[PDB]
Design a protein around this ligand. Structure first.
Ligand code: HEM
Ligand SMILES: CNc1ccc(C(=O)O)cc1
Ligand SMILES: [Cl-]
Length: 393
């Protein structure tokens, strides 16, 4: 009843151009089996959405990568939020919701916006820049590590570490094995910085530690939650912003509309998140035999959710392969959905918004003017290099 496919969604050939394979995956059926990795797969919006919102059946505590924590040792101590199910999940999540709260963004918006503006003005002086290294990477590094309350020394370990985490959700392919075989320095740096003495008061980390007082988390839980932010909070935004600049680079009409109404800044980023889906895929593990899309999946089975595919499903979206900054993007799963839906989404959207706002106000044109290079990661989709010429407004 279930189609078996030999598509490797973690192959380089797939990353280079996933969309035809994603159509094949959608059109093959509501549930596919990927013989390559002995996992179930879901590529349509409906089923991906269904799986995300059924955490009691499709659990996270056996890992949200290919590896089953019930079968193998996790490569690092499990995340107390990402790789946990309710109820253990519930209370750490609340802490992160409050640390990264509506109230908190107020405290950082002026600086994040100022940092975005200064960067765009800086890049306009050079004229020809790499929209990755000089913008997508430089800007988040200039605000987010500080917002964490991180010291200056050692931050070069941050992106490599994030690169690793997202590779480690993947299968035991060369990317993962290669990523993990060189994690010691990154782990040591990040893990050391999660300790309270190393985190500046006022920053997200110290704020996380401050919450041990409420009974919501113990002191020994705080560093891993600090660790979560240092895992998820930087490289994602890099690829989201990079995605957004690339989209604006490829859809000049939409750049022009953005220029004509900078208050479209927040949704053009949101649309970019849908359109590129910086986080491409996650797994769940079935806790029981279960019917999904008329397909019966056994207990203890891995189910691969194609978030990017769900976000390009024509069953749900009109003209999905088109970037439209006034689209109603609500319901996209680029940030997930349900109890694990991105707890850092406000930081990401703030960063993206104020940068796209700066671009909208300061830049007249963005033209690709060099070889474009894709960055390969088992979970993250984004570019290694995007040479562009910025024309000032
Ligand atoms: C473009 C930017 C981002 C994208 C596309 C993204 C994507 C996602 C997705 C898909 C999930 C769901 C994971 C799952 O259901 O298994 C998630 C959760 C999470 N995100 Fe992000 N994220 C972004 C930015 C951020 C930021 C800025 C932070 C922190 C400052 C962050 C930290 C986290 C954490 C800790 C979780 C786990 C939440 C939970 O398990 O309840 N992410 N994100
Ligand atoms: C969805 N992206 C995430 C990656 C890692 C973590 C974590 O370290 O908990 C959380 C979210
Ligand atoms: Cl670690």
């Amino acid at each position: 009843t279930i189609p078996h496919l030999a598509i490797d969604p973690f192959s380089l050939d797939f990353f280079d151009d996933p969309y035809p394979d994603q159509q094949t995956l959608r059109d093959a059926g509501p549930v596919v089996y990927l013989d390559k990795w002995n996992v179930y797969g879901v590529a349509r919006y409906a089923e991906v959405h269904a799986v995300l919102n059924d955490p009691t059946t499709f659990c996270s505590s056996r890992g949200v990568g290919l590896s089953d924590f019930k079968k193998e040792k996790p490569w690092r101590p499990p995340s107390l939020i990402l790789e946990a199910d309710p109820p253990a999940h519930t209370r750490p999540r609340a802490v992160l919701s409050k640390v990264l709260s509506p109230a908190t963004m107020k405290t950082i918006r002026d600086g994040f916006a100022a940092a975005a503006d200064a960067k765009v003005d800086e890049l306009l002086q050079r004229g020809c820049i790499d929209a990755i290294a000089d913008l997508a990477e430089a800007y988040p590094l200039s605000v987010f590590p500080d917002a964490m309350g991180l010291k200056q020394e050692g931050r070069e370990h941050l992106l490599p570490y994030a690169g690793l985490v997202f590779n480690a959700f993947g299968p035991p392919n060369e990317l993962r094995q290669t990523a993990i075989e060189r994690s010691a320095p990154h782990q040591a740096y990040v893990n050391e910085q999660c300790q309270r003495p190393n985190l500046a008061p006022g920053g997200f980390g110290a704020c996380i530690h401050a919450f041990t007082d409420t009974g919501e988390i113990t002191p020994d839980e705080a560093p891993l939650l600090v660790r979560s932010l240092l895992s998820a909070g930087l490289d994602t935004t890099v690829n989201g912003i990079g995605a957004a600049v690339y989209c604006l680079a490829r859809f000049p009409g939409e750049l022009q509309r953005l220029r004509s109404d900078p208050t479209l800044a927040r949704n053009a980023f949101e649309e970019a998140v849908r359109f590129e889906s910086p986080v491409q895929t996650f797994f769940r593990t079935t806790t029981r035999e279960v019917e999904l899309g008329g397909a019966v999946i056994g207990e203890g089975e891995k189910v691969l959710m194609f978030l990017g595919s769900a976000n390009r499903d024509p069953r749900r979206w009109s003209d999905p392969d088109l970037y439209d900054i006034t689209r109603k993007t609500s319901g996209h799963v680029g940030f997930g959905s349900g109890v694990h839906m991105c707890v850092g989404q406000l930081v990401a959207r703030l960063e993206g918004e104020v940068m796209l706002s700066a671009l909208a106000r300061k830049v007249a044109a963005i033209d690709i003017d060099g070889p474009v290079k894709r960055r390969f990661n088992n979970t993250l989709r984004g570019l290694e290099s995007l040479p562009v010429k910025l024309t000032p407004a």
